[PDB]
Design a protein around this motif. Structure first.
Motif, PDB file in Angstrom:
ATOM      1  N   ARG A  70       0.524  -1.407  -0.269  1.00 16.67           N
ATOM      2  CA  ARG A  70      -0.016   0.256   0.506  1.00 16.67           C
ATOM      3  C   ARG A  70       1.027   1.133  -0.203  1.00 16.67           C
ATOM      4  O   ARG A  70       2.165   0.443   0.088  1.00 16.67           O
ATOM      5  CB  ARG A  70      -0.577  -0.352   1.803  1.00 16.67           C
ATOM      6  N   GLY A  71       0.567   2.433  -0.402  1.00 13.53           N
ATOM      7  CA  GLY A  71       0.784   3.485  -0.122  1.00 13.53           C
ATOM      8  C   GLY A  71      -0.010   4.686   0.057  1.00 13.53           C
ATOM      9  O   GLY A  71      -0.982   4.784  -0.620  1.00 13.53           O
ATOM     10  N   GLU A 122       1.675   2.445  -6.613  1.00 16.86           N
ATOM     11  CA  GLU A 122       1.565   1.263  -5.143  1.00 16.86           C
ATOM     12  C   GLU A 122       2.591  -0.239  -4.669  1.00 16.86           C
ATOM     13  O   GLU A 122       3.510  -0.066  -4.051  1.00 16.86           O
ATOM     14  CB  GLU A 122       1.541   2.121  -3.988  1.00 16.86           C
ATOM     15  N   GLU A 161       5.297  -0.960  -7.059  1.00 13.56           N
ATOM     16  CA  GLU A 161       6.802  -0.481  -6.056  1.00 13.56           C
ATOM     17  C   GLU A 161       6.744  -1.340  -5.614  1.00 13.56           C
ATOM     18  O   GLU A 161       7.438  -1.945  -5.270  1.00 13.56           O
ATOM     19  CB  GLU A 161       6.605   0.920  -5.104  1.00 13.56           C
ATOM     20  N   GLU A 190      12.394  -0.337   1.684  1.00 15.17           N
ATOM     21  CA  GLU A 190      11.331   0.478   1.987  1.00 15.17           C
ATOM     22  C   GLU A 190      10.637  -1.075   2.476  1.00 15.17           C
ATOM     23  O   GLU A 190      10.288  -1.318   3.414  1.00 15.17           O
ATOM     24  CB  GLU A 190      10.210  -0.076   0.478  1.00 15.17           C
TER      25      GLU A 190
END
Ligand SMILES: [Mg+2]
Length: 144
Positions: free
Chosen positions: A32-33, A48, A51, A97
């Protein structure tokens, strides 16, 4: 409190869910983002998730199939996805991340929720509509 969009991703036989662990927390959650301004919910989710796990949800996402929750002030909208290959080579496309990407037996999670050494985020407050959604998926099998 910028809204966050992400996806609950189930495999072919709907037995496993794909969760990610960030590099700065040991909690497991959905890829998620944050909404990046001038963009809608679906494009945010597609960008997201790509990524974070390197998989493009364009052909899988259904704007009607999501769970929405307001949590500590933030709006989360988690799209519901089924049929994703377990053997797809998931890998993050951004640096520093995502620490781990793993499939979890969804039934085991529900049984061992607040009982294991394993920490979760978001999914623990969404267990009911998630399992309701899975139930629904079986009920409609004959419709296809
Ligand atoms: Mg992001």
């Amino acid at each position: 409190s910028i809204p966050v969009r992400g996806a609950a991703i189930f495999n072919e036989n709907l037995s496993k869910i794909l969760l990610v662990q960030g590099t700065e927390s040991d909690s497991w959650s959905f890829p998620r983002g944050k909404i990046s301004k001038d963009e809608n919910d679906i494009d945010c989710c597609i960008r997201e998730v790509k990524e974070e796990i390197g998989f493009d949800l364009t052909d899988y996402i259904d704007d009607n199939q999501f769970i929405e929750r307001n949590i500590q002030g933030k709006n989360y909208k988690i799209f519901l996805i089924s049929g994703v290959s377990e053997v797809f080579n998931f890998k993050p496309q951004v640096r520093n991340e995502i620490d781990k990407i793993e499939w979890f037996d969804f039934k085991k999670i529900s049984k061992t929720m607040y009982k294991s050494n394993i920490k979760y985020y978001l999914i623990n407050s969404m267990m009911r509509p998630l399992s309701m959604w899975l139930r629904h998926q079986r009920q409609i099998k004959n419709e296809d």
